[PDB]
Amino acid sequence: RPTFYRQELNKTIWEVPERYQNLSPVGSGAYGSVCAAFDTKTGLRVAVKKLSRPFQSIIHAKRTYRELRLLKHMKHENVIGLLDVFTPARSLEEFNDVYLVTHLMGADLNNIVKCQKLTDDHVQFLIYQILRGLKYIHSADIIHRDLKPSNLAVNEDCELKILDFGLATRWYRAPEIMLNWMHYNQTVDIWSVGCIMAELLTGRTLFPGTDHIDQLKLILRLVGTPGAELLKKISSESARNYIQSLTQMPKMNFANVFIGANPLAVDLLEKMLVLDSDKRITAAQALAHAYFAQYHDPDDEPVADPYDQSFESRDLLIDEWKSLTYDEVISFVPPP
Ligand SMILES: CN(C)c1cc(-c2ccncc2)c(-c2ccc3ccccc3c2)nn1
Ligand SMILES: Fc1ccc(-c2n[nH]cc2-c2ccncc2)cc1
Ligand SMILES: Fc1ccc(-c2n[nH]cc2-c2ccncc2)cc1
Ligand SMILES: [Zn+2]
Protein backbone atom coordinates (compact mmCIF):
# COMPACT_ATOMS: atom_id res chain seq x y z
CA ARG A 1 0.00 0.00 0.00
CA PRO A 2 1.28 3.52 -0.69
CA THR A 3 1.56 6.34 1.85
CA PHE A 4 -1.47 8.67 2.01
CA TYR A 5 -1.72 12.28 3.17
CA ARG A 6 -4.72 14.32 4.20
CA GLN A 7 -5.99 17.84 3.46
CA GLU A 8 -9.16 19.90 3.26
CA LEU A 9 -10.15 21.69 0.03
CA ASN A 10 -13.40 23.69 -0.38
CA LYS A 11 -15.09 21.99 2.61
CA THR A 12 -14.08 18.57 1.25
CA ILE A 13 -11.46 16.16 2.66
CA TRP A 14 -8.95 14.59 0.31
CA GLU A 15 -6.98 11.56 1.40
CA VAL A 16 -4.68 10.64 -1.50
CA PRO A 17 -1.35 8.75 -2.07
CA GLU A 18 1.82 10.91 -1.90
CA ARG A 19 2.41 10.46 -5.64
CA TYR A 20 -0.36 13.02 -6.33
CA GLN A 21 0.82 16.52 -5.40
CA ASN A 22 -0.35 20.14 -5.69
CA LEU A 23 -4.05 19.35 -5.43
CA SER A 24 -6.08 22.26 -6.73
CA PRO A 25 -9.92 22.33 -6.91
CA VAL A 26 -11.32 22.25 -10.46
CA GLY A 27 -14.99 22.06 -9.51
CA SER A 28 -17.72 20.17 -7.75
CA GLY A 29 -20.73 18.30 -9.06
CA ALA A 30 -23.80 16.66 -7.57
CA TYR A 31 -21.90 13.33 -7.80
CA GLY A 32 -18.34 14.27 -6.78
CA SER A 33 -15.66 16.92 -6.62
CA VAL A 34 -12.53 17.21 -8.66
CA CYS A 35 -9.01 18.39 -8.10
CA ALA A 36 -6.25 18.93 -10.60
CA ALA A 37 -2.99 17.39 -9.35
CA PHE A 38 0.51 16.41 -10.49
CA ASP A 39 1.24 12.69 -10.71
CA THR A 40 4.93 12.43 -9.73
CA LYS A 41 5.04 8.84 -10.91
CA THR A 42 4.20 9.58 -14.53
CA GLY A 43 4.99 13.27 -14.76
CA LEU A 44 1.39 13.90 -15.88
CA ARG A 45 -1.16 16.45 -14.79
CA VAL A 46 -4.24 14.49 -13.71
CA ALA A 47 -7.77 15.12 -12.56
CA VAL A 48 -8.79 13.31 -9.38
CA LYS A 49 -12.47 12.80 -8.65
CA LYS A 50 -13.62 11.95 -5.16
CA LEU A 51 -17.10 10.33 -5.28
CA SER A 52 -19.67 11.95 -3.10
CA ARG A 53 -21.57 9.71 -0.59
CA PRO A 54 -20.84 6.63 -2.70
CA PHE A 55 -22.65 4.16 -0.43
CA GLN A 56 -25.37 6.32 1.07
CA SER A 57 -28.16 4.19 -0.39
CA ILE A 58 -28.74 1.28 -2.75
CA ILE A 59 -29.06 3.85 -5.59
CA HIS A 60 -25.69 5.48 -4.81
CA ALA A 61 -24.01 2.19 -4.20
CA LYS A 62 -25.23 0.75 -7.50
CA ARG A 63 -24.29 4.00 -9.27
CA THR A 64 -20.80 3.95 -7.77
CA TYR A 65 -20.38 0.37 -8.99
CA ARG A 66 -21.71 1.28 -12.44
CA GLU A 67 -19.34 4.24 -12.69
CA LEU A 68 -16.32 2.19 -11.72
CA ARG A 69 -17.28 -0.73 -14.00
CA LEU A 70 -17.81 1.62 -16.95
CA LEU A 71 -14.62 3.63 -16.38
CA LYS A 72 -12.51 0.47 -15.99
CA HIS A 73 -13.93 -0.70 -19.31
CA MET A 74 -13.51 2.44 -21.43
CA LYS A 75 -10.16 2.29 -23.28
CA HIS A 76 -10.33 4.68 -26.18
CA GLU A 77 -8.75 7.99 -27.12
CA ASN A 78 -12.07 9.82 -27.26
CA VAL A 79 -13.62 8.40 -24.06
CA ILE A 80 -12.49 9.36 -20.52
CA GLY A 81 -10.73 6.44 -18.90
CA LEU A 82 -8.85 5.52 -15.76
CA LEU A 83 -5.22 6.09 -14.95
CA ASP A 84 -5.87 5.03 -11.31
CA VAL A 85 -8.54 4.30 -8.73
CA PHE A 86 -7.89 4.05 -5.02
CA THR A 87 -9.32 4.28 -1.53
CA PRO A 88 -7.54 5.10 1.70
CA ALA A 89 -9.41 2.13 3.27
CA ARG A 90 -7.18 -0.69 4.43
CA SER A 91 -10.04 -3.24 4.41
CA LEU A 92 -13.60 -3.76 3.18
CA GLU A 93 -15.02 -2.95 6.63
CA GLU A 94 -13.58 0.60 6.60
CA PHE A 95 -14.22 1.16 2.87
CA ASN A 96 -16.20 4.43 2.49
CA ASP A 97 -14.50 6.54 -0.19
CA VAL A 98 -13.59 6.12 -3.82
CA TYR A 99 -11.16 8.26 -5.81
CA LEU A 100 -10.83 8.08 -9.58
CA VAL A 101 -7.89 9.47 -11.59
CA THR A 102 -7.69 10.45 -15.28
CA HIS A 103 -5.68 12.79 -17.60
CA LEU A 104 -6.31 16.41 -16.77
CA MET A 105 -8.44 18.07 -19.51
CA GLY A 106 -8.36 21.85 -19.78
CA ALA A 107 -11.91 22.75 -20.65
CA ASP A 108 -15.27 21.66 -21.99
CA LEU A 109 -16.92 22.22 -25.35
CA ASN A 110 -19.34 24.70 -23.83
CA ASN A 111 -16.40 26.97 -22.86
CA ILE A 112 -15.12 26.73 -26.46
CA VAL A 113 -18.31 27.44 -28.56
CA LYS A 114 -19.35 30.10 -26.03
CA CYS A 115 -16.27 32.12 -27.15
CA GLN A 116 -16.11 32.33 -30.10
CA LYS A 117 -17.46 30.68 -33.31
CA LEU A 118 -15.54 27.70 -34.72
CA THR A 119 -14.01 27.22 -38.14
CA ASP A 120 -15.39 24.40 -40.31
CA ASP A 121 -12.13 22.49 -39.77
CA HIS A 122 -12.65 22.50 -35.98
CA VAL A 123 -16.27 21.50 -36.30
CA GLN A 124 -15.16 18.54 -38.49
CA PHE A 125 -12.47 17.47 -36.03
CA LEU A 126 -14.51 17.88 -32.89
CA ILE A 127 -17.60 16.10 -34.24
CA TYR A 128 -15.44 13.38 -35.80
CA GLN A 129 -13.95 12.70 -32.39
CA ILE A 130 -17.37 12.57 -30.70
CA LEU A 131 -18.57 10.08 -33.26
CA ARG A 132 -15.40 8.01 -33.04
CA GLY A 133 -15.91 7.79 -29.28
CA LEU A 134 -19.61 7.11 -29.73
CA LYS A 135 -18.96 4.24 -32.19
CA TYR A 136 -16.87 2.64 -29.47
CA ILE A 137 -19.42 3.17 -26.69
CA HIS A 138 -22.30 1.95 -28.86
CA SER A 139 -20.39 -1.15 -29.86
CA ALA A 140 -20.42 -2.11 -26.15
CA ASP A 141 -24.24 -1.82 -26.20
CA ILE A 142 -24.05 1.29 -24.05
CA ILE A 143 -26.15 4.46 -24.63
CA HIS A 144 -24.66 7.66 -23.29
CA ARG A 145 -28.06 9.40 -22.92
CA ASP A 146 -26.80 12.80 -21.79
CA LEU A 147 -24.45 14.11 -24.39
CA LYS A 148 -24.09 17.87 -24.32
CA PRO A 149 -21.32 20.44 -24.60
CA SER A 150 -20.59 20.48 -20.87
CA ASN A 151 -20.02 16.69 -20.97
CA LEU A 152 -17.35 16.86 -23.62
CA ALA A 153 -13.80 17.57 -22.44
CA VAL A 154 -11.43 19.32 -24.87
CA ASN A 155 -7.78 20.30 -24.46
CA GLU A 156 -5.80 23.14 -26.09
CA ASP A 157 -4.81 20.72 -28.84
CA CYS A 158 -8.54 20.23 -29.75
CA GLU A 159 -8.38 16.65 -28.51
CA LEU A 160 -11.80 15.62 -27.25
CA LYS A 161 -13.07 13.06 -24.75
CA ILE A 162 -16.63 12.02 -23.85
CA LEU A 163 -16.88 12.17 -20.01
CA ASP A 164 -18.10 9.60 -17.38
CA PHE A 165 -21.77 9.51 -18.53
CA GLY A 166 -21.92 7.41 -16.39
CA LEU A 167 -22.26 8.98 -12.96
CA ALA A 168 -29.93 22.52 -19.78
CA THR A 169 -29.58 18.83 -20.66
CA ARG A 170 -33.03 19.17 -22.19
CA TRP A 171 -31.78 21.13 -25.23
CA TYR A 172 -29.72 18.21 -26.59
CA ARG A 173 -32.31 15.45 -25.83
CA ALA A 174 -33.98 13.35 -28.51
CA PRO A 175 -37.68 14.05 -29.06
CA GLU A 176 -38.67 10.45 -28.29
CA ILE A 177 -37.27 11.01 -24.74
CA MET A 178 -39.30 14.21 -24.39
CA LEU A 179 -42.26 11.89 -25.20
CA ASN A 180 -41.12 9.54 -22.48
CA TRP A 181 -40.71 6.52 -24.78
CA MET A 182 -39.38 3.60 -22.77
CA HIS A 183 -37.78 1.87 -25.79
CA TYR A 184 -35.48 4.53 -27.19
CA ASN A 185 -32.28 3.29 -28.88
CA GLN A 186 -28.64 4.34 -29.24
CA THR A 187 -29.54 6.96 -31.88
CA VAL A 188 -30.79 9.21 -29.06
CA ASP A 189 -27.03 10.04 -28.84
CA ILE A 190 -26.86 10.82 -32.59
CA TRP A 191 -29.69 13.34 -32.09
CA SER A 192 -27.60 15.00 -29.37
CA VAL A 193 -24.52 15.09 -31.67
CA GLY A 194 -26.67 16.76 -34.34
CA CYS A 195 -27.74 19.42 -31.85
CA ILE A 196 -24.12 19.94 -30.76
CA MET A 197 -22.87 20.15 -34.35
CA ALA A 198 -25.58 22.68 -35.29
CA GLU A 199 -24.59 24.82 -32.34
CA LEU A 200 -20.87 24.74 -33.26
CA LEU A 201 -21.69 25.80 -36.82
CA THR A 202 -24.13 28.60 -35.94
CA GLY A 203 -22.93 29.65 -32.46
CA ARG A 204 -26.52 29.27 -31.13
CA THR A 205 -28.44 26.60 -29.26
CA LEU A 206 -30.56 24.86 -31.88
CA PHE A 207 -33.51 23.95 -29.64
CA PRO A 208 -33.50 26.10 -26.47
CA GLY A 209 -36.72 24.65 -24.98
CA THR A 210 -37.98 26.14 -21.72
CA ASP A 211 -39.56 22.78 -20.71
CA HIS A 212 -40.32 19.36 -22.24
CA ILE A 213 -43.37 20.53 -24.19
CA ASP A 214 -41.64 23.65 -25.52
CA GLN A 215 -38.62 21.46 -26.38
CA LEU A 216 -40.76 19.15 -28.44
CA LYS A 217 -42.42 22.13 -30.13
CA LEU A 218 -39.13 23.73 -31.15
CA ILE A 219 -38.01 20.40 -32.60
CA LEU A 220 -41.14 19.83 -34.66
CA ARG A 221 -40.99 23.32 -36.09
CA LEU A 222 -37.58 22.51 -37.68
CA VAL A 223 -38.10 18.89 -38.68
CA GLY A 224 -41.88 18.87 -39.23
CA THR A 225 -44.61 17.07 -37.35
CA PRO A 226 -44.40 13.27 -37.73
CA GLY A 227 -45.59 11.57 -40.90
CA ALA A 228 -47.81 8.47 -40.98
CA GLU A 229 -45.04 5.88 -40.75
CA LEU A 230 -43.77 7.40 -37.47
CA LEU A 231 -47.24 8.02 -35.95
CA LYS A 232 -47.91 4.29 -36.34
CA LYS A 233 -45.09 3.54 -33.85
CA ILE A 234 -46.51 5.68 -31.04
CA SER A 235 -48.29 3.32 -28.63
CA SER A 236 -49.27 6.05 -26.15
CA GLU A 237 -52.84 7.27 -26.80
CA SER A 238 -52.31 10.56 -25.03
CA ALA A 239 -48.96 11.25 -26.74
CA ARG A 240 -50.51 10.48 -30.14
CA ASN A 241 -53.58 12.65 -29.41
CA TYR A 242 -51.38 15.47 -28.42
CA ILE A 243 -49.02 15.27 -31.42
CA GLN A 244 -51.88 14.84 -33.91
CA SER A 245 -53.72 17.73 -32.17
CA LEU A 246 -50.87 20.06 -33.12
CA THR A 247 -51.05 22.24 -36.18
CA GLN A 248 -49.30 20.07 -38.80
CA MET A 249 -45.91 21.47 -39.86
CA PRO A 250 -43.58 20.75 -42.80
CA LYS A 251 -39.94 19.84 -42.55
CA MET A 252 -37.87 22.96 -43.13
CA ASN A 253 -35.20 23.17 -45.79
CA PHE A 254 -31.91 22.64 -43.89
CA ALA A 255 -29.86 24.30 -46.68
CA ASN A 256 -31.85 27.47 -45.94
CA VAL A 257 -31.79 27.22 -42.15
CA PHE A 258 -28.04 26.59 -41.91
CA ILE A 259 -27.19 28.64 -45.01
CA GLY A 260 -23.51 29.60 -45.09
CA ALA A 261 -22.42 26.32 -43.51
CA ASN A 262 -20.44 23.77 -45.49
CA PRO A 263 -23.10 21.91 -47.54
CA LEU A 264 -21.57 18.60 -46.43
CA ALA A 265 -22.21 19.55 -42.81
CA VAL A 266 -25.76 20.42 -43.65
CA ASP A 267 -26.25 17.06 -45.38
CA LEU A 268 -24.93 15.23 -42.28
CA LEU A 269 -27.11 17.29 -39.95
CA GLU A 270 -30.14 16.29 -41.95
CA LYS A 271 -29.12 12.62 -41.49
CA MET A 272 -28.72 13.03 -37.71
CA LEU A 273 -31.77 15.18 -36.98
CA VAL A 274 -34.29 12.68 -38.42
CA LEU A 275 -37.45 12.60 -36.30
CA ASP A 276 -37.89 8.78 -36.61
CA SER A 277 -34.98 7.23 -34.68
CA ASP A 278 -35.12 4.07 -36.83
CA LYS A 279 -34.06 6.33 -39.74
CA ARG A 280 -31.22 8.26 -38.07
CA ILE A 281 -27.68 7.67 -39.19
CA THR A 282 -25.61 5.60 -36.78
CA ALA A 283 -22.18 6.65 -35.40
CA ALA A 284 -20.32 4.15 -37.68
CA GLN A 285 -22.19 5.32 -40.75
CA ALA A 286 -21.65 8.99 -39.78
CA LEU A 287 -17.88 8.45 -39.59
CA ALA A 288 -17.95 7.35 -43.24
CA HIS A 289 -19.81 10.52 -44.31
CA ALA A 290 -17.90 12.63 -46.83
CA TYR A 291 -17.83 15.58 -44.35
CA PHE A 292 -15.08 13.71 -42.46
CA ALA A 293 -12.96 12.66 -45.49
CA GLN A 294 -9.91 14.49 -44.02
CA TYR A 295 -10.16 12.48 -40.76
CA HIS A 296 -11.86 9.15 -41.43
CA ASP A 297 -9.81 5.98 -41.31
CA PRO A 298 -11.80 2.72 -41.00
CA ASP A 299 -8.70 0.92 -39.68
CA ASP A 300 -8.43 3.39 -36.80
CA GLU A 301 -12.04 3.58 -35.48
CA PRO A 302 -12.08 0.69 -32.99
CA VAL A 303 -14.88 -1.12 -31.29
CA ALA A 304 -15.03 -2.08 -27.64
CA ASP A 305 -14.59 -5.37 -25.89
CA PRO A 306 -17.86 -6.95 -24.74
CA TYR A 307 -19.40 -5.17 -21.75
CA ASP A 308 -21.36 -7.12 -19.16
CA GLN A 309 -24.26 -4.93 -18.00
CA SER A 310 -26.19 -7.76 -16.37
CA PHE A 311 -25.65 -6.22 -12.92
CA GLU A 312 -28.11 -3.48 -14.02
CA SER A 313 -31.06 -5.84 -13.54
CA ARG A 314 -29.95 -6.89 -9.97
CA ASP A 315 -31.48 -5.85 -6.67
CA LEU A 316 -28.67 -6.14 -4.16
CA LEU A 317 -27.97 -4.95 -0.63
CA ILE A 318 -25.83 -1.84 -0.08
CA ASP A 319 -23.04 -4.01 1.36
CA GLU A 320 -23.12 -6.26 -1.70
CA TRP A 321 -22.70 -3.30 -4.06
CA LYS A 322 -19.99 -2.00 -1.78
CA SER A 323 -18.07 -5.29 -1.75
CA LEU A 324 -18.34 -5.57 -5.55
CA THR A 325 -17.00 -2.01 -5.88
CA TYR A 326 -14.22 -2.86 -3.48
CA ASP A 327 -13.22 -5.91 -5.53
CA GLU A 328 -13.12 -3.69 -8.65
CA VAL A 329 -10.85 -1.17 -6.90
CA ILE A 330 -8.46 -3.93 -5.74
CA SER A 331 -8.36 -5.64 -9.16
CA PHE A 332 -7.64 -2.49 -11.18
CA VAL A 333 -4.57 -2.73 -13.40
CA PRO A 334 -3.24 0.61 -14.66
CA PRO A 335 -2.77 1.14 -18.35
CA PRO A 336 0.74 1.11 -19.80
C1 LIG B 1 -17.22 19.06 -16.84
N1 LIG B 1 -17.54 17.85 -16.09
C2 LIG B 1 -18.94 17.49 -15.86
C3 LIG B 1 -16.53 16.97 -15.64
C4 LIG B 1 -15.16 17.17 -15.86
C5 LIG B 1 -14.22 16.23 -15.40
C6 LIG B 1 -12.77 16.49 -15.74
C7 LIG B 1 -12.18 17.76 -15.64
C8 LIG B 1 -10.87 17.93 -16.02
N2 LIG B 1 -10.16 16.91 -16.54
C9 LIG B 1 -10.71 15.69 -16.71
C10 LIG B 1 -12.03 15.46 -16.32
C11 LIG B 1 -14.68 15.07 -14.72
C12 LIG B 1 -13.78 14.02 -14.23
C13 LIG B 1 -12.72 14.30 -13.37
C14 LIG B 1 -11.89 13.28 -12.94
C15 LIG B 1 -12.12 11.99 -13.36
C16 LIG B 1 -11.29 10.97 -12.96
C17 LIG B 1 -11.47 9.66 -13.40
C18 LIG B 1 -12.54 9.40 -14.25
C19 LIG B 1 -13.38 10.43 -14.67
C20 LIG B 1 -13.16 11.72 -14.23
C21 LIG B 1 -14.00 12.73 -14.66
N3 LIG B 1 -15.99 14.90 -14.54
N4 LIG B 1 -16.90 15.84 -15.01
F1 LIG C 1 -51.27 19.74 -23.25
C1 LIG C 1 -50.79 18.49 -23.30
C2 LIG C 1 -51.53 17.46 -23.90
C3 LIG C 1 -51.03 16.16 -23.95
C4 LIG C 1 -49.77 15.87 -23.40
C5 LIG C 1 -49.19 14.49 -23.45
N1 LIG C 1 -49.85 13.34 -23.26
N2 LIG C 1 -48.93 12.27 -23.39
C6 LIG C 1 -47.68 12.70 -23.68
C7 LIG C 1 -47.76 14.08 -23.75
C8 LIG C 1 -46.59 14.93 -24.04
C9 LIG C 1 -46.71 16.12 -24.73
C10 LIG C 1 -45.58 16.90 -24.98
N3 LIG C 1 -44.36 16.50 -24.55
C11 LIG C 1 -44.23 15.34 -23.88
C12 LIG C 1 -45.33 14.52 -23.61
C13 LIG C 1 -49.05 16.91 -22.80
C14 LIG C 1 -49.55 18.21 -22.75
F1 LIG D 1 -43.42 13.77 -32.20
C1 LIG D 1 -42.60 12.73 -32.22
C2 LIG D 1 -41.23 12.90 -31.99
C3 LIG D 1 -40.40 11.79 -31.99
C4 LIG D 1 -40.93 10.51 -32.20
C5 LIG D 1 -40.09 9.32 -32.24
N1 LIG D 1 -38.93 9.29 -32.94
N2 LIG D 1 -38.44 7.99 -32.84
C6 LIG D 1 -39.21 7.21 -32.07
C7 LIG D 1 -40.30 7.96 -31.67
C8 LIG D 1 -41.36 7.41 -30.77
C9 LIG D 1 -41.99 8.21 -29.82
C10 LIG D 1 -42.94 7.64 -28.95
N3 LIG D 1 -43.25 6.34 -29.03
C11 LIG D 1 -42.63 5.54 -29.94
C12 LIG D 1 -41.66 6.04 -30.81
C13 LIG D 1 -42.29 10.36 -32.44
C14 LIG D 1 -43.12 11.46 -32.42
ZN1 LIG E 1 -28.87 10.82 -4.56
Residue numbers in the entry: 5 to 171, 184 to 352
What do the authors say?
Mammals have four different genes that encode distinct p38 MAPK isoforms (p38α, p38β, p38γ, p38δ) with high sequence similarity (e.g, p38α has approximately 75% sequence identity to p38β). The four p38MAPK isoforms are widely expressed and selectively initiate downstream responses dependent on the cell type and the activating stimulus. In neurodegenerative disease models, specific p38MAPK signaling cascades involving substrates such as MAPKAP-K2 (MK2) and tau have been implicated in controlling neuroinflammation, neuronal plasticity, and synaptic/dendritic pathology. The p38αMAPK is of neuropharmacology interest as it is associated with intracellular signal transduction in both glia and neurons under stresses that are linked to progressive synaptic dysfunction.
The novel, brain penetrant inhibitors are soluble, acidic, and chemically stable small molecules targeted to the active site of p38αMAPK. To confirm the active site targeting of MW108 and MW181 and test prevailing hypotheses, we determined the high-resolution co-crystal structures of human p38αMAPK in complex with the two selective inhibitors. The diffraction data clearly reveals the inhibitor presence in the active site. The pyridine ring nitrogen of MW108 makes H-bond interactions with the protein backbone at the Met109-Gly110 peptide bond. The relative positions of Met 109 in the hinge region and the hydrophobic pocket’s small gatekeeper residue Thr 106 are indicated by arrows. High-resolution crystallographic analysis of human p38αMAPK in complex with the new selective inhibitors confirmed the active site targeting and, interestingly, demonstrated the lack of a detectable glycine flip in the structures. The finding that the less selective p38 inhibitor SB239063 can induce the glycine flip, whereas MW108 and MW181 do not, indicates that the ability to induce such a localized conformational change is not a prerequisite for active site targeted probes with greater specificity. Large-scale kinome screens of MW108 revealed only p38αMAPK as a potential target. The ability of MW108 to engage its target in a cellular assay was done by examining the concentration-dependent inhibition of phosphorylated MK-2, considered a highly selective p38αMAPK substrate. In vitro and in vivo assays demonstrated the ability of MW108 and MW181 to ameliorate beta-amyloid induced synaptic and cognitive dysfunction.
